Write a protein that binds this ligand. Sequence first.
Ligand SMILES: *[C@@H]1O[C@H](CO)[C@@H](O[C@@H]2O[C@H](CO)[C@@H](O[C@H]3O[C@H](CO)[C@@H](O)[C@H](O)[C@@H]3O)[C@H](O)[C@H]2NC(C)=O)[C@H](O)[C@H]1NC(C)=O
Ligand SMILES: *[C@@H]1O[C@H](CO)[C@@H](O[C@@H]2O[C@H](CO)[C@@H](O[C@H]3O[C@H](CO)[C@@H](O)[C@H](O)[C@@H]3O)[C@H](O)[C@H]2NC(C)=O)[C@H](O)[C@H]1NC(C)=O
Ligand SMILES: *[C@@H]1O[C@H](CO[C@H]2O[C@@H](C)[C@@H](O)[C@@H](O)[C@@H]2O)[C@@H](O[C@@H]2O[C@H](CO)[C@@H](O)[C@H](O)[C@H]2NC(C)=O)[C@H](O)[C@H]1NC(C)=O
Ligand SMILES: *[C@@H]1O[C@H](CO[C@H]2O[C@@H](C)[C@@H](O)[C@@H](O)[C@@H]2O)[C@@H](O[C@@H]2O[C@H](CO)[C@@H](O)[C@H](O)[C@H]2NC(C)=O)[C@H](O)[C@H]1NC(C)=O
Lengths: 275, 275, 144, 139
Amino acid sequence: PPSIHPAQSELIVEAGDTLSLTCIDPDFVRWTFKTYFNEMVENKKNEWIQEKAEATRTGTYTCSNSNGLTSSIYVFVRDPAKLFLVGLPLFGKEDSDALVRCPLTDPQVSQYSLIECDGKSLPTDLTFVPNPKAGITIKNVKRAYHRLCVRCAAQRDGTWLHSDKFTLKVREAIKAIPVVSVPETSHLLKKGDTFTVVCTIKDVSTSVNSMWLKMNPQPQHIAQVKHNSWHRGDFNYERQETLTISSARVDDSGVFMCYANNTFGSANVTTTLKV
Amino acid sequence: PPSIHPAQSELIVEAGDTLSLTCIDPDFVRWTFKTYFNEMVENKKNEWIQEKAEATRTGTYTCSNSNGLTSSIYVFVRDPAKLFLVGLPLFGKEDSDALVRCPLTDPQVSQYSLIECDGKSLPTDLTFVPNPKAGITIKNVKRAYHRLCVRCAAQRDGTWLHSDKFTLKVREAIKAIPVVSVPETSHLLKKGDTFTVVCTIKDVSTSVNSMWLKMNPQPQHIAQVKHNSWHRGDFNYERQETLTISSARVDDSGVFMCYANNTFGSANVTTTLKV
Amino acid sequence: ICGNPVTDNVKDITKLVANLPNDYMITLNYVAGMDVLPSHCWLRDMVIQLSLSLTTLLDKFSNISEGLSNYSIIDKLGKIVDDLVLCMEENAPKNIKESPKRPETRSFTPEEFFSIFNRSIDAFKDFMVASDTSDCVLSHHHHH
Amino acid sequence: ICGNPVTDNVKDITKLVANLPNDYMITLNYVAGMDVLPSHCWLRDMVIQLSLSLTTLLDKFSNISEGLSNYSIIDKLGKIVDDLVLCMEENAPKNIKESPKRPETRSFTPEEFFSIFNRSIDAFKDFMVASDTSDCVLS
Ligand SMILES: *[C@@H]1O[C@H](CO)[C@@H](O[C@@H]2O[C@H](CO)[C@@H](O[C@H]3O[C@H](CO)[C@@H](O)[C@H](O)[C@@H]3O)[C@H](O)[C@H]2NC(C)=O)[C@H](O)[C@H]1NC(C)=O
Ligand SMILES: *[C@@H]1O[C@H](CO)[C@@H](O[C@@H]2O[C@H](CO)[C@@H](O[C@H]3O[C@H](CO)[C@@H](O)[C@H](O)[C@@H]3O)[C@H](O)[C@H]2NC(C)=O)[C@H](O)[C@H]1NC(C)=O
Ligand SMILES: *[C@@H]1O[C@H](CO[C@H]2O[C@@H](C)[C@@H](O)[C@@H](O)[C@@H]2O)[C@@H](O[C@@H]2O[C@H](CO)[C@@H](O)[C@H](O)[C@H]2NC(C)=O)[C@H](O)[C@H]1NC(C)=O
Ligand SMILES: *[C@@H]1O[C@H](CO[C@H]2O[C@@H](C)[C@@H](O)[C@@H](O)[C@@H]2O)[C@@H](O[C@@H]2O[C@H](CO)[C@@H](O)[C@H](O)[C@H]2NC(C)=O)[C@H](O)[C@H]1NC(C)=O
């Protein structure tokens, strides 16, 4: 593998000071650097000079080989102003993890932890794992954490320092059957008169697939349906499927079903018409 | 009559320069000065020295006599930055006048007029009368001018200059009888049961006097009434007079009138009760 | 010549504030020493200032529909304070040698701004039939 | 893995704007060259920024009652853009040597801010099944 001159796994350079890396290899290709926002900065020179190094240059640098070998060194560009790197939102799937992207530029600090952005108490079952090179990870995310704002905290020489507000947004792990409902159970009118039936679908996400059916010879699907959707609450999505048929006939008569299926289960409600 | 040394009706002094007035009289009492905001500044000395004269000192200065005689001199304290003296609101009675208080500090300007504060066109029937010593007066105020913003403009050496925004607020000329209304015409219950009657008064101002009466032997007035008022629109005021009597009796029975009178006319609606 | 200026429209302030950014600054020329001095010392001046501020405030909104919009409320709150300016005009004293120094230009949050509005309304309610013999001296800051 | 992010809640923007001070500045890190460049060049970045901005915006209001309050609308508009961030995550390309220069911090009026919001919504609608091979350069 390539040999990086600053022969150490971690390097602490001061902000404003120059930052130079060098990797020696006969089959050298390029240098690679992952930005806070997942981007790859490239440099095709043996030595990478960084005059007046900015805190944003903190991160892992990788020297690439033509043979396919890699060697990396993590650099901390310490700035007193920016102890934490911020800029990205906080997302997280339910029953999964959520990384609070607040990596530090100074690893020489204690008590690196999470705290409620307004000083309050954190949920009893909230568990987190600190990581100077990435941020703080929230273990096992629940729907009760939706809209929780946190701050990364660390003690620097006795004094406490906080990062910007991180407001967690959680993705619902769809594990329930949809909820369908229709006003009337059965209704009928004469030919010519137009009728309208509005089906109400309720679920925790927008992913639900809803549709209107015309089951007489076999469950047939109709494309003439008006879509309407609203976010009623945190995990309360609602879609209103409106079936409209202009000038009713003898052909347009029978039982209509409103089907809606999740990645979990499915639901259905039927209404009767006879014209 | 008092003799003011600057023997001239008008004086144009420069802002920053010293301003001195002197009036000679054996029976001298005090000097008087009207401020932009109707206030009287007093000086009990023969000569009134004003070092570094400010634009705000513009106005008419009056020398008072012990015999009861007065002599005035209007002084202009020219300021290029502050041409118009501004600070007061804009009020006006319907069918009356409305002085846009924007006196100037420089009388040596042309086209002293009123313009729409955003550059639009002024009402067709809007007529105004300029006056360097007071401001621009709006003639014959109508309800259609309610909430009109204007700016005083004047051309100073070819270039145009504008004052701050003056938003006109008009007082309604009262020329209509009030409007009274009551839900029920007649109703009755047994003793002990409490009853409530809400009278609705409508008019263009808050000045309406409304009241509840108990006319059996003679129209008597009752003080136990809840007041409620709302501004429904520009000239739509509404008051709801609520008559409440706890534990009805034989004594509390008959015809009740809701009287409301303007400075123009009066209205009334009666309701019947028998317990 | 003054009827009943204050209406139930003042009950919509809580709603209004909750519907305005808590970091939005409303400009209001504040009369120095309003919390300590008695009502009559600043009431007239503040009412004029609130009238100006609410007028400017309304300019920042548009009339949408029937629903209680910020424009609606602000409009009506302006009406109230406008009437108070005229109701303070009739009780305006005959001035003689008085020119302290004009109101300081300050900016407040909606919450703060209407707190000042409410105090002014209250200070007007008990302004009528009230002894205003108290002095307008700052030195009496131990609350008076 | 992406359903139907956009809802009818976007129809309440006109009402929302009319209910916000026209001189109130909303901070939004603007991606330089958004009006000229094609959707795919800035869409993902802008959606992330709108998500952040709407989150901060919501912090400025309180939940009053049932009536359509600014808090209500903003909340829901945030939900929409949040889903779009995840819906742009699955289509996120495998990055190789690309690091122009982060978005400029700008402030806009409500009117302006939601004009940008709407454009983003529209640019997402026709992002699906659309020709975007055009490499994102200066032109
Ligand atoms: C519409 O929703 C209906 C409600 O779930 C559903 O109807 C029928 O539901 C029953 C019971 O849930 C299913 O029968 C099951 O139980 C019987 C014993 O009682 C077993 O013999 C079956 O094998 C099965 O496990 C039916 O399968 C189901 N369909 C019928 C026959 O009506 C439907 O799933 C939905 N659509 C319709 C109307 O088919
Ligand atoms: C309550 O409203 C009442 C009606 O508006 C009013 O009572 C009296 O109403 C009658 C007509 O309904 C008026 O009568 C006038 O005309 C008749 C001829 O038909 C003659 O008696 C006189 O020419 C008279 O002007 C009364 O004038 C009117 N009021 C009187 C004097 O009784 C009440 O005025 C309203 N309530 C009050 C008294 O304020
Ligand atoms: C929700 O259901 C639809 C399937 O729609 C119909 O499919 C029939 C075969 C039958 O099961 C009926 O009850 C049901 O309502 C899934 O979408 C696709 O729909 C087409 C219809 O032409 C089918 O041909 C596809 O097999 C089906 N799936 C695919 C491959 O897209 C949809 O996937 C399902 N949601 C989930 C993931 O549970
Ligand atoms: C507005 O109405 C009030 C009260 O209304 C009563 O006035 C009586 C004179 C009589 O016409 C009766 O029918 C009517 O209901 C007037 O105010 C005063 O009210 C008291 C009684 O509460 C009377 O004793 C006074 O005379 C009356 N006026 C006076 C001189 O104070 C009021 O005059 C009338 N006009 C307005 C708009 O002020």
